[PDB]
Design an enzyme around this catalytic site. Sequence first.
Site, mmCIF file in Angstrom:
data_model
loop_
_atom_site.group_PDB
_atom_site.id
_atom_site.type_symbol
_atom_site.label_atom_id
_atom_site.label_comp_id
_atom_site.label_asym_id
_atom_site.label_seq_id
_atom_site.Cartn_x
_atom_site.Cartn_y
_atom_site.Cartn_z
ATOM 1 N N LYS A 51 0.830 -1.194 0.000
ATOM 2 C CA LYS A 51 0.000 0.000 0.000
ATOM 3 C C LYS A 51 0.873 1.256 0.000
ATOM 4 C CE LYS A 51 -2.871 0.958 -1.207
ATOM 5 N NZ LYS A 51 -2.152 2.055 -0.505
ATOM 6 N N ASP A 100 -7.531 -1.877 -7.230
ATOM 7 C CA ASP A 100 -6.281 -1.264 -7.670
ATOM 8 C C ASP A 100 -6.409 -0.690 -9.075
ATOM 9 O OD1 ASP A 100 -3.132 -1.165 -7.033
ATOM 10 O OD2 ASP A 100 -3.445 -1.604 -9.160
ATOM 11 N N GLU A 156 -6.679 3.569 -9.717
ATOM 12 C CA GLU A 156 -5.732 4.376 -10.481
ATOM 13 C C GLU A 156 -6.388 5.080 -11.660
ATOM 14 O OE1 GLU A 156 -3.300 1.056 -10.894
ATOM 15 O OE2 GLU A 156 -3.816 0.590 -12.976
HETATM 16 O O1 LIG Z 1 -0.141 0.297 -10.680
HETATM 17 C C1 LIG Z 1 0.259 1.006 -9.819
HETATM 18 N N1 LIG Z 1 1.396 1.670 -9.976
HETATM 19 C C2 LIG Z 1 1.865 2.481 -9.000
HETATM 20 N N2 LIG Z 1 3.051 3.225 -9.065
HETATM 21 C C3 LIG Z 1 3.322 3.958 -7.993
HETATM 22 C C4 LIG Z 1 4.534 4.854 -7.783
HETATM 23 C C5 LIG Z 1 5.648 4.699 -8.587
HETATM 24 C C6 LIG Z 1 6.752 5.510 -8.394
HETATM 25 C C7 LIG Z 1 6.737 6.470 -7.395
HETATM 26 C C8 LIG Z 1 5.620 6.618 -6.589
HETATM 27 C C9 LIG Z 1 4.517 5.807 -6.781
HETATM 28 S S1 LIG Z 1 2.072 3.721 -6.878
HETATM 29 C C10 LIG Z 1 1.152 2.628 -7.824
HETATM 30 C C11 LIG Z 1 -0.030 1.920 -7.694
HETATM 31 O O2 LIG Z 1 -0.670 2.017 -6.703
HETATM 32 N N3 LIG Z 1 -0.452 1.133 -8.689
HETATM 33 O O3 LIG Z 1 -1.642 0.416 -8.548
HETATM 34 MG MG LIG Z 2 -2.483 0.394 -6.054
HETATM 35 MG MG LIG Z 3 -2.094 -0.595 -10.259
#
Ligand SMILES: O=c1[nH]c2nc(-c3ccccc3)sc2c(=O)n1O
Ligand SMILES: [Mg+2]
Ligand SMILES: [Mg+2]
Lengths: 476, 480
Positions: free
Chosen positions: A167, A216, A220
């Site tokens: 998370k 999820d 997004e």
């Molecule tokens: O697919 C997803 N990709 C994703 N990438 C995130 C991220 C990447 C780099 C820096 C900060 C956050 S968070 C997140 C997420 O929750 N889901 O579902």
């Molecule tokens: Mg997520």
């Molecule tokens: Mg995702």
Amino acid sequence: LDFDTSVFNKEKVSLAGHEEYIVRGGRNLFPLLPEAFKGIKQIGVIGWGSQGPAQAQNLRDSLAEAKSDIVVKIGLRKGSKSFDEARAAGFTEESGTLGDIWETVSGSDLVLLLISDAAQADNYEKIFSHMKPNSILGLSHGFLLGHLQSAGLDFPKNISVIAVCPKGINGAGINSSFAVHQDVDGRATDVALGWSVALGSPFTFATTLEQEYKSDIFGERGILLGAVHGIVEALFRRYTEQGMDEEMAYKNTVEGITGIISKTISKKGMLEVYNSLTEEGKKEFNKAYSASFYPCMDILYECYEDVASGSEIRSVVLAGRRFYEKEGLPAFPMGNIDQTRMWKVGEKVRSTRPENDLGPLHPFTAGVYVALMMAQIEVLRKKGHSYSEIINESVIESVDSLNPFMHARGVAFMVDNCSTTARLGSRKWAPRFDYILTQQAFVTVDKDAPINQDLISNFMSDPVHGAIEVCAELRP
Amino acid sequence: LDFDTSVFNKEKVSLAGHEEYIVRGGRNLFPLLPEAFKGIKQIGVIGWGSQGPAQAQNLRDSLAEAKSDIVVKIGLRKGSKSFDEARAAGFTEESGTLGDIWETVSGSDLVLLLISDAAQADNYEKIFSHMKPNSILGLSHGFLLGHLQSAGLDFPKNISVIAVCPKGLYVGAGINSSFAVHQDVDGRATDVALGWSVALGSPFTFATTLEQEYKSDIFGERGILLGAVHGIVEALFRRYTEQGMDEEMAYKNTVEGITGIISKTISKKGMLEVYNSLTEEGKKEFNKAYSASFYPCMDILYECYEDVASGSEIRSVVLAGRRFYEKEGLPAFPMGNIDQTRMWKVGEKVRSTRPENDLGPLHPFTAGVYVALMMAQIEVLRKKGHSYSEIINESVIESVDSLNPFMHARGVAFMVDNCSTTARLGSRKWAPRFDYILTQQAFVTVDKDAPINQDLISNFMSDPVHGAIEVCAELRPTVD
Ligand SMILES: O=c1[nH]c2nc(-c3ccccc3)sc2c(=O)n1O
Ligand SMILES: [Mg+2]
Ligand SMILES: [Mg+2]
Ligand SMILES: O=c1[nH]c2nc(-c3ccccc3)sc2c(=O)n1O
Ligand SMILES: [Mg+2]
Ligand SMILES: [Mg+2]
């Protein structure tokens, strides 16, 4: 949602009167790891991207702490440019901790599949064919299950299927949700819990693999990326149409949401965003909320059902194959979302922005953003999700994790640093939120429609505000 | 694509060097209907709505002219208002020409299923269960095939399945059709389908497959027919006004131009004539817009087509229609208004002053984006294996001759929301994507003074579709 662990104690938490069981982590529990990893002598970690290093590193490190004989081995595909870093982290062939993907799959009793969503869709058959009968498949995210269900398929019935999904100083770490999709021998729950604990998860929440990938993938496309980009573009255009200077328009939308609005929600929740406005500001907030809640819910509701039905995952799979030439048509890799007016304007604002600046708290913008947040909550709530999942995906991760990226460097820095599936979702659904707000919400406001006090009343008194408080005390 | 017809004579047409087979219609052929319809004693027209009335009435009239004893019986539910409209057309239970859907289906040798997409997806099992062994199911659109295929299903094996699909006068007059034979259990299917199309008054009937029909149709309304044209005029209006152009001149230079002079030009002499009619400076601008917009448009068209072909989009439509009603504790979300925003309020004011027969200005930049969109749709459908006749009907003719005139008359809502529910949903879902891709990519490429892909332009100028379109325009009903 109940589970049965013979190794760990689960604790009860109450959220809006709904009792959820959770399991707290701790290096003090590493001695419990060999009990949890019963029957496992090798853990194969396939893929070395953003999760590979940390997960392998943590698993190897916590297992050594427990003085476990379990081998943590990475498997990488032929052509991976991460062999060198895998060796840098101490994972090598001579030590038996590094090897080829298929070879590594064959020898592992627990297979942690950390490769990309597209790779899983193009390779699940070969992964299944190389896995040991009666072994355990470990997923950090439920995409693969959604892919299989979209074709009327499931996992092989000879393997266990679990998920430990992330998370995001005693007590540091990152919370996780865990799911047991199949359990062929009764070890699944404890191996997933041990996997979460081994990672340093201060808290492990229980969910189902179907609810994880739905929440999820939908989340997004909603407030996390898609929706916030859409409503920010809609308001920038509205404000500038109304004569407000471009830079204050940017600051009254992006800067506000990603800064002061986000920090306010993070500390004292949504109800303290409203209570912080002037009396005139509360009225503009309520006009915007009252007009925006249902339009936002319209798209959120549609997006959720496309994710749950299999339409969206199929779309994501096919979109990924269109990144390359096929059927005599050109390749269409993802393009740039940050070279339009408002983001070129946003570049100017940031060049002279002082540090720790949080931008203006525009009551109208606040009303729209909070309406979207509350609309996502209601959709997930009526679709059967638990409050921990709802809050940890509609509130915490956007205001504490993703919004800072937008405030930092703009929409692209936020969106294109996420998974390919997330990047595709944001591009597909942001235009939808932009249009419905412009076509419906903004028309309602410009009609001078009266305030829907049922919505406002329900907002003020929503149980989720109290659940968000409890959940806040659960964050690391 | 070939077919074998014993009753009717098939004609060959050359389109960009590709042969197709068409069947010429006409009242003069009605003497051949008794043999085309052998084995049929009752045709059951299920549903009224937009097609039922016309199909039923025309079939009845044509069969009477042929001196046939076949009965056309309408199948409807007693609770519908359509039940009295059928009676007002001379269809009565009292005469054997009106009855409940289910009893009508069970007694029919040819079942014409003209109910809505959503009703078809909800009731197909019960339609199949009431059909007689070896009977024929006829569709005017292949939505039902897409719905079944999205679930890994197909039609029952014990019936034939055909389609006669209006590309739309019976009083060249009429509407052309495409026809398909999906299943043929006894060898009569092709002649009944052609007899059906001829009896409707189709001047020309084109050959297709059920799969290609529903793909091209559902994709097409999400592309240039509705979704894409809406998305590009929103993007072009926003760009023009952001550049300083008066709101009303921007509406004129986008909507009025596309749905007026540009549409009339393409309808008369095709896409090259829009280029030829420009100034030497407008030709430059046109090539700038086209070069920047061809691939961004293909991007979304390509994505939309694969969503339609894969089953994703048809399932989304079925679920969207169920969200029209309250369920699972959530509100009902009927379709909303799309024409209450700024640019359509400006359009109303333009029209309040417009003289009759105004075709609007021909803005070369607008022309480049619109022709790029229409050529990009042509390219996607070509690469995906459709015939030139299907491509041109769905990507050129229907837009410029049928739908665009509705936008010219009273704005986007009058065009979009007169179409089918499936089409109205598609427009709203995909219009935003064409607007965003044009703004994020095509327009950015222009503002960077990017070089012109001369291969694109040369390919545009030399494309074989322009000659194919000239042959297809000569097949349009009446003269136009
Ligand atoms: O697919 C997803 N990709 C994703 N990438 C995130 C991220 C990447 C780099 C820096 C900060 C956050 S968070 C997140 C997420 O929750 N889901 O579902
Ligand atoms: Mg997520
Ligand atoms: Mg995702
Ligand atoms: O779904 C569809 N709906 C639809 N509606 C049309 C129409 C409606 C009212 C007045 C004039 C034309 S044409 C057409 C079409 O081709 N497809 O596919
Ligand atoms: Mg159509
Ligand atoms: Mg249609």
